[PDB]
């Protein structure tokens, strides 16, 4: 290695391994951030603009980066927004404490210093956040789908996308149930427009020579509910095996109506050159199913599972509201709608272009997550690097105050808070520089609501922009990377063991 | 000894503009109707030459991630239409390697993604504005035989390229729908036989298998509609009393048949060729060791359905046939089976005997890339005068619209119109010519006079107005073409990094 | 990827240049030491066959060749080399930056120019006009240059005039088949007219037979199962028995135990022919070729006329005199080594062919490179006629075919730069009746020596060196 020993080097060391792993996140911050691309080894090339996504599959070895990415993937899994934020603030405290390490700074000064700070913030943050929620978001919800557009102004889609909002808000609340991401999947479609886009609350999925065998389903069933097969379907001792086969075929039919199931599933291959065998049964069926739509449709309809041949069960046809099944742009799909428990709504991604669904997943999944955490939480503060210019400044005022060592740890730490609204503005593609002069300059005088405009690269009042984001999470987010930072610090030797 | 593995986001871009232009600039020479083919030569024990681009990319192998993304969409428009892949490819690397400059000038790549999508707008509007479609190609028979003179241009099948030119618009005319306007999988145009010549290729609306006859001596014309297709298996005295079962089990194909009327009822696998001379002689035709996947195929010759199985075989359900001929289907080898007496195939495929192989894919591909334009002509009857003359007249707009932009979308739309120019240098190089002179002479020309066919004569022929020349395309196609390339030089410089796991410092 | 193709073109070309004309040098045909002790061959068609070549392009080429060789006649050399300096010409323009597309469209207007300078000059022969053989003679001996059979060329000769009224119908060439044995000379050739297989069941089966049926095997406690198989196979026989054949191929292997009983029955158990003279025998004579014989019984059957077994010169020279069609004239020589069998059936078979196009199309242009200048005159006239970059592509096309005659001019071991170029400025004044002859090394009318070459692969050659070029010159990458 390179100086892994007692104390300053090793710390030094440290500090140097969390800025290189925050260098492969650094430049996806900000909703129209950088991408990458990741191949998985055998030759399946990942591309993805979330940070969160790029950490979870990264190849870290160094320790100082494993206990920084298991850091990040905590805060991920404790709150889904904002996952490159505390790594990169974090990396920041440790690259700005970096040039006070090898002049004597004791880290236990920094650890200590880096926890009152983090404790004023805290307090100071409360002390600004505003309540919104009551303000006409429940009910008169033109506060909600204004604050809702935020991710799609300014862009091709702007004439629509008070549609797409109003709609998905509307499945939104008749689903507040603490909505999950998972449970509420979108599905492309080959052809059509971005107009008529439209949501099942249900599943979408295409019918293909292994997924569905017989076409012209009944429709208008009332009662459709699915029977989960674990047996093939489609079809001295030399013609004992043929005996034994032929049997198996006839003993196939007998679930026909033995068992009584409008819909069955399976996991082994279907046949669609034998739909006519399957005419004959007459009745719909599934095969080589994603477990997206087997989940989605045991938590919304509850079809039955069957192990044995002639497995008989009461849930085979079960109560099920309705059975939909309409072409979507020349291809019929398979909708499995009308559910007693159907918490499921699935959007149909319509449109010519095929390239758009990088596009869309990255602006319709954007806007749910901030319509459902501005519903969630009630009070919001500016966001777009507002609310770290601010706590800088506050910061800065706080530490010339305190006589001492922890002074210039906490001017250090109000230095880097500043990184957020400056990677933003960078990424951006502005000179940060002169946006981050404006920013701080009206914002120690003017007001305490200013941060980044992505459109006109221009320093803006995004509190009348409503760009909100909830207090609680931004406090939990600063307290994540302080803390990790901390613990950075606090490690000084690093033991083996390597084979004996 | 001191390797290093870091890519830094600039020079990151720097490597992938590369392969672009590594993976472009390399097919750009096959652009236009007298390109320079691509010889393709497999790594094991195929060689193979060819002019499509969107096949040479297709066969060739790329190791930077960067060109199989961009080859596998490729790939993924040929899929959508098949035309203008070249143009794409091309068009992207043009735009790449002269937006390199913008990147070493400083302009960050967001602001060059924007401002290219910006001059796409315009040049989409622009081409819309300049289209002078025809709308009359619906009854146009006679007009559609000038419109795939270009696409077959490039060859000398001009001698009988009128035959094949009718056989297309009769293949799109006995499928014409005016609701869907598509053709299916099942539908397939497609049948390669080795042998023969340029108007052996000649239109018949039939089943086409090349298996063996059910005998030397059964008369292979055979008119009764009775016809079927079975699955019908193989499967110490023990040996004869087997033989004797299975010939019981056949006796169903002999005696316990004619009620259910399968006179004509092909097999597939091994069979005894006594009961083969016992049906001659009862005269029950039956065609033993045929394909697998030919099952559909010889039953949908009059647009029926697949009967394999031996109890779902019905009357209604018999074999299919197309329409009653005599010819010989072999001149030198053996008669092709014939499958044509009854009906009009819905899934029609027109039959191809051509001599040479080369001339097969050239005559499949041009056939399915004339069904292509087709499709488009009767879902939407709006074309354009191309030939570089529309690229010239979207450079022009895009450079006007610069003098009243932005900072960084106007010098991203003077970049998107120096890039929209390479195709007609690319045309001209390929026709051999001055590259540069020819472009800028026929831009002059092209803002002197307010026509916007003025392009690139390739052919060497008179004048460079293509309305004479019937050189074509579609609105749809060039909209498709210039909206995917934007799209293509977006998102490559979205990207900044690569990384890969199992990393090597 | 072009100057490797290209590089790779022009070293196939030079491999067989050395062979052209009736002086080239000899090749060995060498390989891993295990089978190559030494193998020579002054053609260069068979050179092509046993190259192992590496460059696709030069693969193309080669598959060019061998169409060449098996379509009409023998060019493949010419064709090679042609195309060889096609392409070196090629290379030498591309060297001073000219556009292969325009190279290509010269090429294309000027082959088409010494194609119907080529037709210009064509002159019909009199043998399918006024019954002449010395054209006959000629086109033969051109042809079959290079080899030794001149003595009995007289006999190889008369079949090829007995071939256009009774061996033909509109250029048939499968009615004549060529074998021969080891141990002999050049006076040997002789008219057969069957194959020289013998009879299996001894000494006292006759000679002659009565009428011949010919067709094809089909076959030849377990042992319960092989006794009823056995049985089978004797009422089988017995059935044969009844159908009085006294000829009939047996493809598959049988023994002695049905062999005496196939004797006894009439039937000659044919121990699997070569199936070249079950070919001949089904054209000629009526014999058809099936899988099985169970189903034949009366109407199925062969037809012949008289076929008979006699022993002549200490070897077993069956004589299948008296068949329905007298076309089956076949060659029996006797050669000594193993190269005079190979050597003697594609001369045999290359000049059938061209006669068989000569009594096809009766048109033909004297050989020994005066045609090739005179396509090369035409050429060059139209070359400097015409304006732009194109010239320099056809006055390249006029080099190449320049410098295809000076190949059999340096084979032959004479000058080069002088005969040639003395023939060039000749044919402007000394035209197509003027010519090369390697007999005396110097110019000479060629239509007084009267060797010719028949038109059609003339034109073939022309037309498939230039195609060949084309298709090549258009690579460009891998
Ligand atoms: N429209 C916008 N205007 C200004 N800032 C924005 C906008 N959208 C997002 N941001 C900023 O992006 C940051 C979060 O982005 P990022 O960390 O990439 O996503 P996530 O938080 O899901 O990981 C927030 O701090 C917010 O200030
Ligand atoms: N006769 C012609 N005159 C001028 N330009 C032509 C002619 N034929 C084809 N082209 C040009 O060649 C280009 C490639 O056409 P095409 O072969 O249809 O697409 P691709 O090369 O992608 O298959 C087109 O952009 C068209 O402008
Ligand atoms: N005796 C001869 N006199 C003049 N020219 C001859 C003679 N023999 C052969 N040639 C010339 O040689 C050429 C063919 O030579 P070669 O390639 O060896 O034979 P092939 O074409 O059968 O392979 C012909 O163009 C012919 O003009």
Same mark, same amino acid.
């Given at each position: 290695?390179?100086? &892994? *020993?007692?104390? @300053?080097? !090793?710390?030094?060391?440290?500090?140097?391994?969390?800025? #290189?792993? =925050?260098?492969?996140?650094?430049?996806?911050?900000?909703?129209?951030?950088?991408?990458?691309?990741?191949?998985?080894?055998?030759?399946?090339?990942?591309?993805?603009?979330?940070?969160?996504?790029?950490?979870?599959?990264?190849?870290?070895?160094?320790?100082?980066?494993?206990?920084?990415?298991?850091?990040?993937?905590?805060?991920?899994?404790?709150?889904?927004?904002?996952?490159?934020?505390?790594?990169?603030?974090?990396?920041?405290?440790?690259?700005?404490?970096?040039?006070?390490?090898?002049?004597?700074?004791?880290?236990?000064?920094?650890?200590?210093?880096?926890?009152?700070?983090?404790?004023?913030?805290?307090?100071?943050?409360?002390?600004?956040?505003?309540?919104?929620?009551?303000?006409?978001?429940?009910?008169?919800?033109?506060?909600?789908?204004?604050?809702?557009?935020?991710?799609? &102004? *300014?862009?091709? @889609?702007? !004439?629509?996308?008070?549609?797409?909002?109003?709609?998905? #808000?509307? =499945?939104?609340?008749?689903?507040?149930?603490?909505?999950?991401?998972?449970?509420?999947?979108?599905?492309?479609?080959?052809?059509?427009?971005?107009?008529?886009?439209?949501?099942?609350?249900?599943?979408?999925?295409?019918?293909?020579?292994?997924?569905?065998?017989?076409?012209?389903?009944?429709?208008?069933?009332?009662?459709?509910?699915?029977?989960?097969?674990?047996?093939?379907?489609?079809?001295?001792?030399?013609?004992?095996?043929?005996?034994?086969?032929?049997?198996?075929?006839?003993?196939?039919?007998?679930?026909?109506?033995?068992?009584?199931?409008?819909?069955?599933?399976?996991?082994?291959?279907?046949?669609?050159?034998?739909?006519?065998?399957?005419?004959?049964?007459?009745?719909?069926?599934?095969?080589?199913?994603?477990?997206?739509?087997?989940?989605?449709?045991?938590?919304?309809?509850?079809?039955?599972?069957?192990?044995?041949?002639?497995?008989?069960?009461?849930?085979?046809?079960?109560?099920?509201?309705?059975?939909?099944?309409?072409?979507?742009?020349?291809?019929?799909?398979?909708?499995?709608?009308?559910?007693?428990?159907?918490?499921?709504?699935?959007?149909?991604?319509?449109?010519?272009?095929?390239?758009?669904?990088?596009?869309?997943?990255?602006?319709?999944?954007?806007?749910?997550?901030?319509?459902?955490?501005?519903?969630?939480?009630?009070?919001?503060?500016?966001?777009?690097?507002?609310?770290?210019?601010?706590?800088?400044?506050?910061?800065?005022?706080?530490?010339?105050?305190?006589?001492?060592?922890?002074?210039?740890?906490?001017?250090?730490?109000?230095?880097?808070?500043?990184?957020?609204?400056?990677?933003?503005?960078?990424?951006?593609?502005?000179?940060?520089?002169?946006?981050?002069?404006?920013?701080?300059?009206?914002?120690?005088?003017?007001?305490?609501?200013?941060?980044?405009?992505?459109?006109?690269?221009?320093?803006?009042?995004?509190?009348?922009?409503?760009?909100?984001?909830?207090?609680?999470?931004?406090?939990?987010?600063?307290?994540?990377?302080?803390?990790?930072?901390?613990?950075?610090?606090?490690?000084?030797?690093?033991?083996?063991?390597?084979?004996? | 000894?001191?390797?290093?593995?870091?890519?830094?986001?600039?020079?990151?871009?720097?490597?992938?503009?590369?392969?672009?232009?590594?993976?472009?600039?390399?097919?750009?020479?096959?652009?236009?109707?007298?390109?320079?083919?691509?010889?393709?030569?497999?790594?094991?024990?195929?060689?193979?030459?060819?002019?499509?681009?969107?096949?040479?990319?297709?066969?060739?192998?790329?190791?930077?991630?960067?060109?199989?993304?961009?080859?596998?969409?490729?790939?993924?428009?040929?899929?959508?239409?098949?035309?203008?892949?070249?143009?794409?490819?091309?068009?992207?690397?043009?735009?790449?390697?002269?937006?390199?400059?913008?990147?070493?000038?400083?302009?960050?790549?967001?602001?060059?993604?924007?401002?290219?999508?910006?001059?796409?707008?315009?040049?989409?509007?622009?081409?819309?504005?300049?289209?002078?479609?025809?709308?009359?190609?619906?009854?146009?028979?006679?007009?559609?035989?000038?419109?795939?003179?270009?696409?077959?241009?490039?060859?000398?099948?001009?001698?009988?390229?009128?035959?094949?030119?009718?056989?297309?618009?009769?293949?799109?005319?006995?499928?014409?729908?005016?609701?869907?306007?598509?053709?299916?999988?099942?539908?397939?145009?497609?049948?390669?036989?080795?042998?023969?010549?340029?108007?052996?290729?000649?239109?018949?609306?039939?089943?086409?298998?090349?298996?063996?006859?059910?005998?030397?001596?059964?008369?292979?014309?055979?008119?009764?509609?009775?016809?079927?297709?079975?699955?019908?298996?193989?499967?110490?005295?023990?040996?004869?009393?087997?033989?004797?079962?299975?010939?019981?089990?056949?006796?169903?194909?002999?005696?316990?048949?004619?009620?259910?009327?399968?006179?004509?009822?092909?097999?597939?696998?091994?069979?005894?060729?006594?009961?083969?001379?016992?049906?001659?002689?009862?005269?029950?035709?039956?065609?033993?060791?045929?394909?697998?996947?030919?099952?559909?195929?010889?039953?949908?010759?009059?647009?029926?359905?697949?009967?394999?199985?031996?109890?779902?075989?019905?009357?209604?359900?018999?074999?299919?046939?197309?329409?009653?001929?005599?010819?010989?289907?072999?001149?030198?080898?053996?008669?092709?089976?014939?499958?044509?007496?009854?009906?009009?195939?819905?899934?029609?495929?027109?039959?191809?005997?051509?001599?040479?192989?080369?001339?097969?894919?050239?005559?499949?591909?041009?056939?399915?890339?004339?069904?292509?334009?087709?499709?488009?002509?009767?879902?939407?009857?709006?074309?354009?005068?191309?030939?570089?003359?529309?690229?010239?007249?979207?450079?022009?707009?895009?450079?006007?619209?610069?003098?009243?932009?932005?900072?960084?979308?106007?010098?991203?739309?003077?970049?998107?119109?120096?890039?929209?120019?390479?195709?007609?240098?690319?045309?001209?190089?390929?026709?051999?010519?001055?590259?540069?002179?020819?472009?800028?002479?026929?831009?002059?020309?092209?803002?002197?006079?307010?026509?916007?066919?003025?392009?690139?004569?390739?052919?060497?022929?008179?004048?460079?107005?293509?309305?004479?020349?019937?050189?074509?395309?579609?609105?749809?196609?060039?909209?498709?073409?210039?909206?995917?390339?934007?799209?293509?030089?977006?998102?490559?410089?979205?990207?900044?990094?690569?990384?890969?796991?199992?990393?090597?410092? | 990827?072009?100057?490797?193709?290209?590089?790779?073109?022009?070293?196939?070309?030079?491999?067989?240049?050395?062979?052209?004309?009736?002086?080239?040098?000899?090749?060995?045909?060498?390989?891993?030491?295990?089978?190559?002790?030494?193998?020579?061959?002054?053609?260069?068609?068979?050179?092509?066959?046993?190259?192992?070549?590496?460059?696709?392009?030069?693969?193309?080429?080669?598959?060019?060749?061998?169409?060449?060789?098996?379509?009409?006649?023998?060019?493949?050399?010419?064709?090679?080399?042609?195309?060889?300096?096609?392409?070196?010409?090629?290379?030498?323009?591309?060297?001073?930056?000219?556009?292969?597309?325009?190279?290509?469209?010269?090429?294309?207007?000027?082959?088409?120019?010494?194609?119907?300078?080529?037709?210009?000059?064509?002159?019909?022969?009199?043998?399918?006009?006024?019954?002449?053989?010395?054209?006959?003679?000629?086109?033969?001996?051109?042809?079959?240059?290079?080899?030794?059979?001149?003595?009995?060329?007289?006999?190889?000769?008369?079949?090829?005039?007995?071939?256009?009224?009774?061996?033909?119908?509109?250029?048939?060439?499968?009615?004549?088949?060529?074998?021969?044995?080891?141990?002999?000379?050049?006076?040997?050739?002789?008219?057969?007219?069957?194959?020289?297989?013998?009879?299996?069941?001894?000494?006292?089966?006759?000679?002659?037979?009565?009428?011949?049926?010919?067709?094809?095997?089909?076959?030849?406690?377990?042992?319960?199962?092989?006794?009823?198989?056995?049985?089978?196979?004797?009422?089988?026989?017995?059935?044969?028995?009844?159908?009085?054949?006294?000829?009939?191929?047996?493809?598959?292997?049988?023994?002695?135990?049905?062999?005496?009983?196939?004797?006894?029955?009439?039937?000659?158990?044919?121990?699997?022919?070569?199936?070249?003279?079950?070919?001949?025998?089904?054209?000629?004579?009526?014999?058809?070729?099936?899988?099985?014989?169970?189903?034949?019984?009366?109407?199925?059957?062969?037809?012949?006329?008289?076929?008979?077994?006699?022993?002549?010169?200490?070897?077993?020279?069956?004589?299948?005199?008296?068949?329905?069609?007298?076309?089956?004239?076949?060659?029996?020589?006797?050669?000594?080594?193993?190269?005079?069998?190979?050597?003697?059936?594609?001369?045999?078979?290359?000049?059938?062919?061209?006669?068989?196009?000569?009594?096809?199309?009766?048109?033909?242009?004297?050989?020994?490179?005066?045609?090739?200048?005179?396509?090369?005159?035409?050429?060059?006239?139209?070359?400097?006629?015409?304006?732009?970059?194109?010239?320099?592509?056809?006055?390249?096309?006029?080099?190449?075919?320049?410098?295809?005659?000076?190949?059999?001019?340096?084979?032959?071991?004479?000058?080069?730069?002088?005969?040639?170029?003395?023939?060039?400025?000749?044919?402007?004044?000394?035209?197509?009746?003027?010519?090369?002859?390697?007999?005396?090394?110097?110019?000479?009318?060629?239509?007084?020596?009267?060797?010719?070459?028949?038109?059609?692969?003339?034109?073939?050659?022309?037309?498939?060196?230039?195609?060949?070029?084309?298709?090549?010159?258009?690579?460009?990458?891998?």
């Amino acid at each position: 290695g390179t100086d &892994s *020993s007692q104390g @300053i080097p !090793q710390l030094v060391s440290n500090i140097s391994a969390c800025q #290189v792993i =925050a260098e492969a996140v650094r430049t996806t911050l900000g909703p129209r951030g950088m991408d990458k691309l990741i191949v998985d080894g055998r030759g399946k090339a990942t591309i993805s603009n979330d940070g969160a996504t790029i950490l979870k599959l990264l190849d870290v070895v160094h320790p100082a980066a494993k206990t920084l990415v298991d850091i990040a993937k905590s805060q991920d899994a404790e709150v889904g927004d904002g996952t490159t934020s505390v790594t990169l603030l974090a990396a920041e405290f440790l690259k700005q404490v970096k040039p006070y390490v090898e002049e004597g700074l004791h880290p236990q000064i920094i650890i200590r210093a880096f926890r009152t700070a983090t404790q004023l913030a805290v307090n100071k943050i409360k002390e600004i956040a505003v309540t919104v929620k009551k303000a006409d978001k429940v009910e008169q919800r033109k506060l909600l789908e204004k604050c809702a557009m935020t991710a799609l &102004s *300014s862009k091709l @889609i702007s !004439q629509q996308k008070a549609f797409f909002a109003k709609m998905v #808000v509307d =499945a939104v609340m008749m689903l507040d149930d603490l909505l999950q991401l998972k449970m509420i999947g979108i599905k492309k479609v080959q052809g059509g427009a971005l107009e008529d886009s439209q949501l099942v609350a249900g599943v979408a999925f295409k019918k293909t020579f292994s997924y569905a065998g017989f076409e012209m389903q009944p429709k208008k069933y009332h009662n459709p509910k699915i029977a989960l097969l674990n047996v093939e379907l489609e079809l001295e001792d030399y013609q004992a095996i043929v005996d034994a086969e032929w049997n198996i075929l006839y003993d196939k039919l007998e679930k026909i109506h033995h068992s009584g199931a409008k819909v069955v599933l399976s996991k082994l291959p279907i046949g669609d050159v034998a739909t006519q065998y399957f005419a004959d049964r007459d009745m719909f069926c599934a095969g080589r199913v994603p477990e997206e739509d087997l989940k989605r449709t045991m938590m919304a309809c509850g079809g039955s599972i069957q192990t044995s041949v002639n497995a008989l069960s009461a849930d085979v046809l079960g109560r099920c509201q309705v059975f939909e099944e309409t072409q979507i742009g020349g291809e019929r799909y398979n909708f499995f709608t009308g559910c007693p428990k159907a918490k499921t709504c699935t959007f149909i991604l319509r449109g010519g272009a095929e390239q758009f669904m990088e596009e869309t997943e990255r602006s319709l999944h954007d806007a749910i997550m901030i319509v459902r955490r501005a519903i969630k939480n009630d009070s919001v503060v500016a966001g777009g690097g507002a609310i770290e210019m601010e706590l800088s400044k506050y910061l800065r005022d706080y530490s010339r105050t305190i006589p001492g060592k922890q002074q210039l740890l906490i001017g250090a730490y109000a230095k880097a808070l500043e990184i957020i609204p400056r990677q933003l503005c960078d990424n951006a593609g502005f000179d940060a520089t002169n946006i981050l002069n404006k920013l701080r300059a009206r914002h120690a005088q003017g007001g305490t609501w200013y941060g980044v405009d992505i459109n006109n690269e221009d320093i803006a009042d995004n509190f009348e922009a409503f760009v909100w984001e909830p207090a609680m999470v931004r406090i939990n987010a600063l307290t994540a990377a302080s803390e990790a930072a901390c613990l950075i610090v606090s490690v000084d030797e690093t033991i083996k063991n390597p084979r004996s | 000894q001191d390797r290093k593995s870091r890519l830094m986001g600039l020079e990151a871009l720097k490597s992938h503009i590369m392969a672009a232009k590594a993976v472009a600039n390399t097919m750009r020479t096959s652009l236009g109707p007298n390109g320079l083919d691509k010889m393709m030569v497999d790594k094991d024990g195929d060689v193979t030459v060819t002019n499509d681009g969107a096949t040479i990319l297709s066969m060739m192998d790329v190791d930077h991630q960067i060109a199989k993304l961009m080859v596998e969409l490729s790939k993924s428009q040929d899929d959508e239409i098949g035309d203008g892949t070249t143009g794409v490819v091309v068009l992207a690397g043009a735009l790449l390697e002269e937006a390199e400059q913008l990147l070493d000038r400083g302009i960050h790549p967001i602001r060059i993604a924007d401002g290219y999508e910006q001059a796409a707008r315009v040049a989409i509007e622009h081409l819309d504005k300049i289209s002078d479609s025809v709308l009359v190609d619906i009854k146009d028979t006679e007009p559609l035989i000038q419109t795939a003179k270009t696409t077959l241009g490039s060859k000398v099948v001009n001698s009988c390229h009128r035959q094949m030119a009718e056989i297309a618009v009769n293949a799109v005319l006995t499928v014409a729908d005016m609701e869907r306007r598509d053709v299916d999988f099942e539908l397939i145009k497609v049948e390669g036989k080795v042998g023969g010549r340029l108007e052996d290729t000649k239109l018949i609306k039939g089943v086409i298998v090349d298996k063996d006859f059910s005998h030397p001596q059964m008369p292979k014309k055979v008119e009764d509609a009775k016809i079927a297709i079975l699955t019908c298996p193989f499967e110490v005295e023990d040996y004869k009393a087997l033989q004797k079962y299975e010939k019981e089990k056949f006796e169903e194909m002999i005696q316990q048949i004619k009620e259910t009327g399968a006179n004509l009822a092909i097999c597939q696998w091994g069979f005894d060729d006594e009961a083969n001379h016992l049906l001659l002689q009862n005269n029950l035709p039956a065609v033993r060791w045929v394909g697998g996947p030919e099952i559909e195929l010889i039953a949908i010759a009059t647009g029926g359905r697949i009967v394999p199985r031996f109890s779902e075989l019905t009357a209604e359900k018999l074999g299919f046939a197309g329409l009653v001929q005599e010819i010989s289907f072999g001149t030198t080898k053996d008669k092709m089976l014939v499958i044509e007496q009854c009906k009009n195939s819905r899934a029609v495929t027109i039959f191809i005997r051509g001599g040479n192989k080369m001339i097969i894919e050239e005559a499949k591909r041009s056939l399915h890339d004339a069904l292509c334009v087709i499709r488009n002509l009767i879902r939407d009857n709006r074309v354009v005068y191309g030939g570089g003359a529309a690229e010239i007249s979207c450079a022009l707009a895009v450079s006007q619209e610069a003098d009243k932009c932005p900072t960084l979308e106007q010098y991203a739309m003077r970049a998107f119109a120096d890039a929209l120019e390479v195709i007609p240098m690319a045309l001209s190089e390929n026709s051999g010519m001055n590259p540069i002179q020819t472009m800028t002479e026929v831009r002059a020309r092209q803002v002197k006079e307010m026509n916007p066919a003025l392009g690139i004569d390739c052919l060497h022929k008179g004048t460079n107005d293509m309305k004479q020349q019937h050189v074509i395309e579609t609105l749809i196609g060039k909209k498709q073409q210039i909206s995917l390339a934007t799209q293509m030089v977006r998102m490559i410089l979205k990207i900044d990094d690569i990384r890969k796991p199992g990393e090597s410092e | 990827a072009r100057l490797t193709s290209f590089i790779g073109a022009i070293a196939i070309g030079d491999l067989v240049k050395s062979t052209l004309g009736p002086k080239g040098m000899d090749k060995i045909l060498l390989s891993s030491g295990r089978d190559a002790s030494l193998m020579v061959t002054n053609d260069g068609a068979t050179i092509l066959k046993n190259i192992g070549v590496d460059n696709p392009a030069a693969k193309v080429l080669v598959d060019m060749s061998r169409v060449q060789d098996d379509e009409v006649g023998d060019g493949t050399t010419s064709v090679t080399v042609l195309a060889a300096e096609l392409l070196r010409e090629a290379e030498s323009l591309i060297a001073k930056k000219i556009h292969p597309q325009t190279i290509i469209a010269g090429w294309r207007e000027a082959t088409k120019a010494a194609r119907e300078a080529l037709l210009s000059s064509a002159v019909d022969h009199g043998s399918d006009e006024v019954k002449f053989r010395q054209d006959l003679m000629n086109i033969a001996g051109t042809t079959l240059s290079s080899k030794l059979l001149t003595h009995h060329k007289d006999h190889f000769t008369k079949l090829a005039v007995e071939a256009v009224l009774r061996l033909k119908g509109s250029g048939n060439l499968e009615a004549i088949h060529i074998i021969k044995k080891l141990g002999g000379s050049l006076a040997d050739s002789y008219l057969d007219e069957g194959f020289l297989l013998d009879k299996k069941i001894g000494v006292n089966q006759p000679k002659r037979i009565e009428n011949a049926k010919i067709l094809i095997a089909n076959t030849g406690k377990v042992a319960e199962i092989e006794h009823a198989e056995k049985e089978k196979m004797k009422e089988k026989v017995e059935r044969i028995l009844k159908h009085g054949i006294n000829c009939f191929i047996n493809r598959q292997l049988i023994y002695n135990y049905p062999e005496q009983l196939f004797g006894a029955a009439g039937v000659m158990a044919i121990e699997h022919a070569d199936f070249a003279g079950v070919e001949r025998l089904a054209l000629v004579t009526g014999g058809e070729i099936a899988s099985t014989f169970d189903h034949p019984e009366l109407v199925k059957l062969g037809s012949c006329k008289l076929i008979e077994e006699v022993m002549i010169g200490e070897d077993k020279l069956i004589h299948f005199s008296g068949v329905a069609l007298g076309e089956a004239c076949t060659i029996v020589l006797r050669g000594a080594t193993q190269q005079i069998l190979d050597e003697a059936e594609r001369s045999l078979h290359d000049a059938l062919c061209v006669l068989a196009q000569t009594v096809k199309d009766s048109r033909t242009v004297y050989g020994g490179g005066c045609s090739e200048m005179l396509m090369a005159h035409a050429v060059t006239q139209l070359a400097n006629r015409t304006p732009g970059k194109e010239a320099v592509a056809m006055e390249s096309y006029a080099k190449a075919l320049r410098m295809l005659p000076t190949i059999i001019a340096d084979n032959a071991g004479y000058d080069s730069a002088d005969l040639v170029a003395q023939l060039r400025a000749a044919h402007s004044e000394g035209n197509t009746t003027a010519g090369l002859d390697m007999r005396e090394g110097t110019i000479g009318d060629m239509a007084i020596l009267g060797i010719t070459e028949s038109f059609q692969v003339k034109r073939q050659v022309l037309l498939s060196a230039a195609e060949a070029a084309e298709v090549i010159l258009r690579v460009d990458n891998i």
